[PDB]
Symmetry: none
Subunit: 326 residues, 2 copies
Amino acid sequence: SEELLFLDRETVRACVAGVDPVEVVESVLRSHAAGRTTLPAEGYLPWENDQGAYCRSIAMLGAVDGERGPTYGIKLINAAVSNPSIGLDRAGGCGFLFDPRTARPVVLAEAAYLSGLRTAAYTMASLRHLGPVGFDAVSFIGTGAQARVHAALLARYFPAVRDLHVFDTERSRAEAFTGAGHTVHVHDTAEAAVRASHVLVTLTTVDDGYIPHDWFRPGSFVAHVSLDDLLPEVFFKSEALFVDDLELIRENPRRVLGALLADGDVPVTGSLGGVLTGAVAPVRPRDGVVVSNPFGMAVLDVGLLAEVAAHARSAGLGTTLDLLGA
Amino acid sequence: SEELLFLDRETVRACVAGVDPVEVVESVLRSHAAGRTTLPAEGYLPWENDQGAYCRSIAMLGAVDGERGPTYGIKLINAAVSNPSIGLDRAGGCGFLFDPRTARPVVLAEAAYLSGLRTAAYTMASLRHLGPVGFDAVSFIGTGAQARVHAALLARYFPAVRDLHVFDTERSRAEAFTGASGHTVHVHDTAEAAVRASHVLVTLTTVDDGYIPHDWFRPGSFVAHVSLDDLLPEVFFKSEALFVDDLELIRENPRRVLGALLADGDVPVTGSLGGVLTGAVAPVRPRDGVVVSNPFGMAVLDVGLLAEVAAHARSAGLGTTLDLLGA
């Protein structure tokens, strides 16, 4: 017999509602800091569709030798730059978990929601350890699927947050955004949104940097999820600068922090994993801006899918696919 | 709005029955020779299970611009060396096709059978062009899932083959091996005895060290080196001819004996089977020596075959729709 536990997006959502995704992200970060994760070279398949738009499949294997037992899996994320044009999310795809004994794929999950949830759970972990204590407002630049899942996790982990201050270059999207106990304030300018609070999450798709140091209040934090919004001076003038994995950042010099690392020394304080293990002291905002610049690690998605699968099994959720059919 | 066409093993089996897998492999090999493929590096995740046995996941992406236009996909194939000793096929996994316009996964198939089928189809293509003509015997070293599908394709593509000469380090596996209905199986008690019993050998083991010297081969012999680590270096060096699938791809995996030899100096590589199929290199059939075929294995062949299977499934009304989103 050859079987797959199949978890569609609505099932993955239900499982995430029933587990602690921030606790899982912190556990995998501690495993990674201890050299107890494996992130092999990605499979990368680029092409151009018939309307000459950039398309790709990225196959991201990962292993966690973690705080329960070993986990093995893959995240497969595919994107077409032309998808939004025809009403589709840019990215879509699937994740598997592998049986430690037999290496068989035993779980298949929709993965594009789980990818956004992983990113938001890292943001929450970063705010817990490195953010201002007690912030009651958050600013978003960009108000799509990523803002919705960040807002959902703010309601779970930061109930003091009652006000979201949003800007989107697509004004109609900003006006449609409702969050998750949240009053939404739509601003005419990115500047107004940043100045309206002590906590910024950038969730754009921009290539050109535009956020100067001057926009931040003293005692501010930015989760640089979109990776190309902050001007170089913000990194150099930062009160503290925390990454997920400095080697991943250095290997991606098309993003501004990676580009700066190739020009010479940058004042990187450390990794959030380093903070979680006690290898580096946390720095919360006081006089300046604390910058969090995570590249994103598929070992987080593998760790989250293992927790989601364990929940699905004990709660009898999802469908069994027979791979043979007899 | 996120639907997969799901093809289980028996459904894939049914589809392969109605297509020409060797014709599909030859077509993709010609596309590959012309540079109308993309063959990224394979993704590799190895580990040690709690029995202490070698396990791995291999993620193999590929693209072909061929008979159905551009095709994109992946084979995810995982193996544990311990599986057979607990009564499971060594390898299992899944394949996808991607939409050319959106890149979304749109077909999911069981892949272990179709993996074996692709390997066997390349063996048949290699025998058609580079084998002895009219051979009526084949030897196998290793008698598992790979040998069963090789025997299935011998029955279709080389009906003259009446006798299979087999050896397995576990004789119970060799005794269990039947081939297809037109085959007589002769179990031999050593790998040498199996090799000397015919002029065509397929190595289907999971060994890491070479043991087959040049001396074992009759003159006018052929070896399909599927298992990649069975032949000693002297077999490559003394070969009457030596054909690869992709010489650069073999170069980039020095773990395997041919790759290792290319690292150290000159090896008499004749060319690729794709090169034979397009006319870039002359075929050499066995005459006085041994002809060696050493295919590393290329995902573009899996993607081409899965595209042909998926088109057949649609036409036949086979497979089930999965919803990736739900209610």
